[PDB]
Design a protein around this ligand. Structure first.
Ligand SMILES: OC[C@H]1O[C@@H](O)[C@H](O)[C@@H](O)[C@H]1O
Length: 314
């Protein structure tokens, strides 16, 4: 098997090692319904050529730590899958409402905080290099719409945010000179969020190679917003065009998802977005059963097998 080039048809499968430990099984969606390892299933039946993995610094239960990430990245590599590493710079989930630095970093000087961030990035990438894995892409933060490691890396501290961003960028290039560094925000439909962040980076010499977006549009259907999920997708396509023009950087859809029970609409969304001016699309945790963790319903499996959603990728 060899890694594909070109458009990234991806999945984030960070939960996979925990699910395996908990005893979940995955099956082929054809008549034979063969039990199968999940990455191999995604590659062979869902057209996936790329895998994304989150990194948490000192997580209580160990999942998403460097050690776990190495396991999944080695498996991706062996199966001929390209890898994206997504640094949360937290001990737990990083998202627009929750950007908490690791507890161990909370009393460092700003100068030592930059060094700890840098050392975390380098140590993870160095360990990946040692086991034969060179990521194609790396995110410096995850959905950093308000900044990262708040309050210190808040957009309200543009100099400090930029300095943390650049420590990350520098650390990636140190170990992986050809890795594309992604700044990833949520709400790809929302130009204003992108303007604010990327104008901060412009104003302060922020380094990044690629703009990352999340697209989860089904809420607009459910809340009965005029235009439905299609309007949110069209607004995302407009925003993709806008950031390319204004900042001259390529765009990745780092996360996409629809309700597991919206197979047909999800297939159409992905088919639609595959013609947008992006370098790839990563389905977030496609294998997660409805209800997983806190009640997650935006997987694209049912009865432990892929729905037609990722038929877009085949
Ligand atoms: O369980 C799915 C997870 O989705 C994440 O993006 C979020 O940050 C977590 O708090 C949890 O909702």
């Amino acid at each position: 098997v060899v890694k594909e080039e070109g458009f990234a048809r991806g999945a984030d499968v960070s939960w996979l090692t925990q699910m395996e430990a908990e005893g979940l099984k995955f099956y082929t969606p054809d008549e034979n319904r063969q039990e199968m390892e999940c990455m191999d299933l995604l590659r062979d039946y869902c057209g996936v050529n790329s895998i994304r993995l989150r990194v948490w610094v000192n997580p209580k239960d160990g999942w998403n730590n460097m050690n776990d990430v190495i396991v999944k990245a080695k498996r991706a590599e062996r199966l001929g899958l390209r890898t994206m590493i997504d640094f949360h710079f937290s001990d737990t989930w990083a998202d627009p409402g929750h950007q908490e630095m690791p507890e161990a970093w909370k009393e460092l000087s700003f100068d030592d905080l930059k060094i700890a961030l840098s050392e975390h990035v380098k140590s993870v990438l160095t360990a990946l290099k040692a086991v034969g894995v060179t990521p194609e892409w790396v995110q410096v933060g995850n959905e950093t719409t308000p900044g990262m490691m708040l309050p210190v890396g808040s957009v309200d501290n543009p100099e400090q945010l930029t300095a943390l961003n650049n420590a990350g960028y520098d650390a990636v290039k140190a170990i992986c000179p050809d890795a594309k560094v992604i700044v990833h925000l949520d709400a790809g439909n929302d130009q204003w969020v992108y303007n604010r962040m990327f104008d901060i980076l412009q104003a302060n010499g922020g380094k990044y190679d690629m703009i990352g977006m999340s697209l989860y549009p089904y809420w607009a259907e459910q809340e009965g917003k005029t235009g439905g999920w299609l309007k949110v997708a069209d607004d995302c396509i407009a925003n993709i065009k806008h950031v390319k023009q204004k900042y001259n950087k390529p765009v990745m859809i780092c996360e996409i998802g629809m309700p597991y029970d919206q197979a047909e609409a999800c297939k159409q969304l992905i088919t639609k977005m595959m013609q947008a001016d992006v370098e790839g699309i990563f389905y977030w945790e496609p294998q997660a059963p409805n209800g997983y963790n806190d009640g997650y319903n935006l997987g694209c499996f049912d009865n432990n097998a892929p729905t037609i959603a990722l038929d877009a990728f085949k």
